[PDB]
Scaffold this active site. Sequence first.
Site, PDB file in Angstrom:
ATOM      1  N   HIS A  22       0.827  -1.185   0.000  1.00  0.00           N
ATOM      2  CA  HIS A  22       0.000   0.000   0.000  1.00  0.00           C
ATOM      3  C   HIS A  22       0.873   1.251   0.000  1.00  0.00           C
ATOM      4  O   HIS A  22       0.474   2.244  -0.570  1.00  0.00           O
ATOM      5  CB  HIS A  22      -1.126  -0.061   1.059  1.00  0.00           C
ATOM      6  CG  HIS A  22      -0.738   0.272   2.476  1.00  0.00           C
ATOM      7  ND1 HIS A  22      -0.771  -0.662   3.496  1.00  0.00           N
ATOM      8  CD2 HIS A  22      -0.441   1.455   3.065  1.00  0.00           C
ATOM      9  CE1 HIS A  22      -0.478  -0.073   4.638  1.00  0.00           C
ATOM     10  NE2 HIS A  22      -0.257   1.208   4.404  1.00  0.00           N
TER      11      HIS A  22
ATOM     12  N   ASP B 152       1.080  -7.704   2.281  1.00  0.00           N
ATOM     13  CA  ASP B 152       1.183  -6.273   1.992  1.00  0.00           C
ATOM     14  C   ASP B 152       2.666  -5.903   2.061  1.00  0.00           C
ATOM     15  O   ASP B 152       3.127  -5.389   3.089  1.00  0.00           O
ATOM     16  CB  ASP B 152       0.359  -5.479   3.032  1.00  0.00           C
ATOM     17  CG  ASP B 152      -0.039  -4.106   2.564  1.00  0.00           C
ATOM     18  OD1 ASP B 152       0.660  -3.505   1.746  1.00  0.00           O
ATOM     19  OD2 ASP B 152      -1.071  -3.613   3.038  1.00  0.00           O
TER      20      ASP B 152
ATOM     21  N   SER C  31       2.944   2.168   8.771  1.00  0.00           N
ATOM     22  CA  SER C  31       2.887   1.281   7.604  1.00  0.00           C
ATOM     23  C   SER C  31       4.299   1.052   7.115  1.00  0.00           C
ATOM     24  O   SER C  31       5.008   2.024   6.769  1.00  0.00           O
ATOM     25  CB  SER C  31       2.097   1.912   6.460  1.00  0.00           C
ATOM     26  OG  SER C  31       0.757   2.074   6.803  1.00  0.00           O
TER      27      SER C  31
END
Lengths: 699, 699
Positions: free
Chosen positions: A64, A206, A634
């Site tokens: 992402h 991810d 993240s």
Amino acid sequence: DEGMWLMQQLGRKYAQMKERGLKMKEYDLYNPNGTSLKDAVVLFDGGCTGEVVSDRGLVLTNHHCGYDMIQAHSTLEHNYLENGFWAMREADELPNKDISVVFIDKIEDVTDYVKKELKAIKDPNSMDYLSPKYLQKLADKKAGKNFSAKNPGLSVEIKAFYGGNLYLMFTKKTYTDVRLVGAPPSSIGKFGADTDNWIWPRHTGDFSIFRIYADKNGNPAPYSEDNVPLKPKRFFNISLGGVQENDYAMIMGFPGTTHRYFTASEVDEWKSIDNDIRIRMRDIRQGVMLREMLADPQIKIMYSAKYAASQNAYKRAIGANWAIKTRGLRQNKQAMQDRLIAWGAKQGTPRYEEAVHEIDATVAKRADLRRRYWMIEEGIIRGIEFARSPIPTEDETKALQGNDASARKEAIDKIRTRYSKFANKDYSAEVDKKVAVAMLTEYLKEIPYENLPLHLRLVKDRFAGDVQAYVDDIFARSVFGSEAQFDAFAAVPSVEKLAEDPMVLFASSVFDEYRKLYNELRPYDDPILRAQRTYIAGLLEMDGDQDQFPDANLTLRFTYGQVKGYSPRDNVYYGHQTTLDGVMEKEDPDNWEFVVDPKLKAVYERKDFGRYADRSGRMPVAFCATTHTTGGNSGSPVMNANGELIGLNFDRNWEGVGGDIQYLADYQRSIIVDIRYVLLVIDKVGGCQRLLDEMNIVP
Amino acid sequence: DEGMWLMQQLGRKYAQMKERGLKMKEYDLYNPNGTSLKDAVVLFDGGCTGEVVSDRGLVLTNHHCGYDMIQAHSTLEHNYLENGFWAMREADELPNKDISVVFIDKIEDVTDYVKKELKAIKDPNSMDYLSPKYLQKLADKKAGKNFSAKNPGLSVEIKAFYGGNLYLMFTKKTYTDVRLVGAPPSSIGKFGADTDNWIWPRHTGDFSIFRIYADKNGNPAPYSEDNVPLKPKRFFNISLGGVQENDYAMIMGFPGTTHRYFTASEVDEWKSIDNDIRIRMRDIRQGVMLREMLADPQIKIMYSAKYAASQNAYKRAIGANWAIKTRGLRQNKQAMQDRLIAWGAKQGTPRYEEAVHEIDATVAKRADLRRRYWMIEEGIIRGIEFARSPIPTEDETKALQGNDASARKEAIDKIRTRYSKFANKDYSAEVDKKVAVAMLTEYLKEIPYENLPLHLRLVKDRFAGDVQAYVDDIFARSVFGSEAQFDAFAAVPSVEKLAEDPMVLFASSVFDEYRKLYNELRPYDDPILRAQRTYIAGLLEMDGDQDQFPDANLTLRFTYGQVKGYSPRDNVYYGHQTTLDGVMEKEDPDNWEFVVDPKLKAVYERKDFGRYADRSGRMPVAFCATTHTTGGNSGSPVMNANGELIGLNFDRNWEGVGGDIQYLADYQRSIIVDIRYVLLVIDKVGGCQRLLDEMNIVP
């Protein structure tokens, strides 16, 4: 465990980290005047975290986080976003325009320095103590200019912490040639990225892979064919050891924001203004959107990006309120307040109490303005698409009354460009007409006439309360209602037409009121901020910094905990580890978000796991831990007891949504992709064997 | 553990039950020659199970079993559905029209007697071996009828088991005075009604309480003021002792049907014809119904029931097909017959291989007819509401041709009445026209011209393939298309208008073909039936009845297993016991199905659990167990090792949907309300102390 700890606070938390099972020596983790593991962590592209994992500057972060770079390099013939991307040699690695990673080279407490400099300011209410500009002048003074020329590739920044009670100066090293090396296909990178989002159990791989380029001395350079791979001072070792329930886990990264020191009254404003209004308005909007998508597959293709993004914040507001209803987040913040107020009495310092009360008074004073602001923001600015229809600029208006026929034609063209951007292939005039009538019917109920944007008075005054008639009229008579109508305007454009365009007048009028409320509300922030300095100064002085971490502000923090499942509700347990099995269970080949990759599906059936399967022959996918993470984290490295890389953070479970205000030890969890799974996919889906060669992989 | 075992099979299974934790002596559970626990079980109102729990004929069953009785005694002034109901003396208990309970007084094996009688049937393919009309003759003969006069209240019946290889004669004792004593409010009886339906975990207090009345002698008798409570032969003792993981549970009750002996070719038909078509056609139907319910608050209220009803067997089909897709149902069945074919070779008897082949061949031959039946049943007979509009009877037609005005008007009255019941307050022709177009388009897509119902040929020939204009015409010209159109007909009736009424022609034509196809498929059942008799006889000869139970058939069976949770998917573990906390966790005062009762809520905040709490001070609600149950087992008593009542069965998890064909040990679970919760609601929500006093509650 609770907290997003300053690097400077490692010494003070080293024993608890030992308690939980940290094996590293402290300075191997963070060294304030030498090389350490910290030096392998980067701020990736300004919001995400990432980490260096080879002596040729190979960097891992989330899918992402790499998404935009992967999309920009993708077409119909070579759709990397779908299919993935694995450059088989370093020269095939793709540069990215406008990319950065940043290293935190040095950090130093400069609190006493900054406080000395602040005593030179006359006005005791000056907000210079939080001014980025002022703080940059101080930083430049201490470094001090010409610092950047004498130290090429470095810069300095000062930031505020603990509401202005502690100051850090960061020496950063910034690189802007960072090439895409590899990413998996979207069916792995985003496996269920709307349905499984904010959710554990999780099965999303991810990740994406980049490489930092530099000049031949290893110093920062913009992109050039000369530039060569960075040879970093530190990279993470990848461990194949895996995880076990209760294993130690720690994270470094760059959490963005938290609200750990909210007063109870701020919890009440947050619940009953920000969130209730967001929830209400976004329910109405998604209402009309959902029914239009179900009633037309074309509309469904057009509005499911927008509908999706409306959820991913609405849902966060639902969950946040659920935390105040059921986890006593308010009484928690009331308790902190009273403990301190009592304590200030015993000491004979009343100012803590006065700070708390100055916040409550300010919160109370601004409640209707703030309610009006959130109504217009959520209902009209975010809620009605024609709110963001084109408005002529000064320059444009000036051209349209000039004599320069070509300056006339240029101004029209800039507007035609903005018109087509507003009314793009995903815009439906009819959907937005429906959305508008609903949102405006709620807005006019909740907002009395003498607080309306000036153009909304017309609903009563001209349309006799008929909201449909008002909206119909905007579209019937506006030059932005249809391609036709705009074209007819562009042929004989007068400045007079745009001045009366009812869509222009709408969009201007609501923006004046959004702007006006924003400016009226801005002066109320200063007292709350000044009061917080005092409030938190009291909180630190009464207990200590040890069980009261400083609010996140996009600076490097570490957090620690253990790999652990939890129970979300009566008679349910989620464990600490998902498996490839669980991917296959979720397969639904006619649902985009649950497609399973042909090669992965195939690697599954043949059990082809190298030494990336666990003690029992099951291929892991993701695990979850008691670390305290948030937006900004993240891509953060997850480390085992010897600081070896065990996974990448990528989400937080929905039950820990309220963890930016209170941490819930039994619920909040960081959601981490297992490094073994990352490798499996590189090895067996990508076949990009050169990348496994350069990592230093270990037991 | 697998099995709906015959009471005749208790001795064969008794060791396996001892191994699993059974204490009590065999003959206290079931004795052919005296009183035993079996005597406390009743068939409650045709389709549910219930149990006698006091020496004054007190009966517990589910709330969903008591539903209609409760709803029939509810007005607005005292709405017992909503508020619960508690009679505080026996004289306040409320009678019920058209209600029964049935004891099983005796069970005899009559295989030999039934086989002898069947040798006197000359035709070796007569289906008399499965005929209810015939078997009742053999029953009457054996019982020397007039039996029901010599023994008032009793009656007899013979049923076939294991596909006609075993017969039992039942002697039934039927009471029809059965009165409502206690219900909890629907918020407890139906907590989570449709969200939590087919689901574990579960927090639903699904019980109701009745009493059997009888004459002075305790002999059956219809309702009468002279009737007084039944002193039964046996009642259950109630255990406060509770449940733990792996505790023995066992159930008795009346499971309806199972298809355990399906051939793999029967599995394939069931999947691809029966299930796939229902799934296809109901998806369509339900889609159109949803659009409209979301579109209009009134359509939602009008159509919610019907949508939920369609959703039932749709979800049930979806689950069955999951199980075939992922649990290898077909492989299990294929293996079954493969083994018997091999073993039949070994014996030198092709009987079994010849039988299975015949099932194979008949299922192949009937496939297009059966595909047509399901297309017309799901597509039109259930899909389209105006398929069930009025068709004139023989009698009404005959009166509209006569010269009898009295008969003419009576006819019209009857037709008006069926018209009003079809076009009732929940009926929308707009909705119906929309559904009908979606459904007919799929039907005309699948089913070719030569196999249409005659009136459906008009779409092609008369309406140029336009399905929408066809349905428009039917409503435009039909006497049942609107209220006014009907009234214009009732003023000037004639057979000729009804003969040429396009809706009458539609409903006649579709029912002709439906009946017609039903009738062509009927002959194909006998070969399968006769082949099954041989197939099941062979399996039994080969492997015995040990681990091979006879298909359910609405007769008294027992099942055993242990209280045990399970893992529904990767990293998710549901346990065995739910708690009153779980109820609270689900409270949602705006949603109808999750309203919590103020008084229940208060008992939780007070911890007012008396001796009902588990030993850790938590209040149980439900538990699950590995017992094998299906429809018919609603209200069935759950027993501990000593045969004391520990709960009431009321549902099955969806994970066990395929349980009627393939038992899935690791996955399937009976869902059971904890009897301690049941008592709690009596004590602390009913306050109905007398019902606890008349029970025998042991530790």
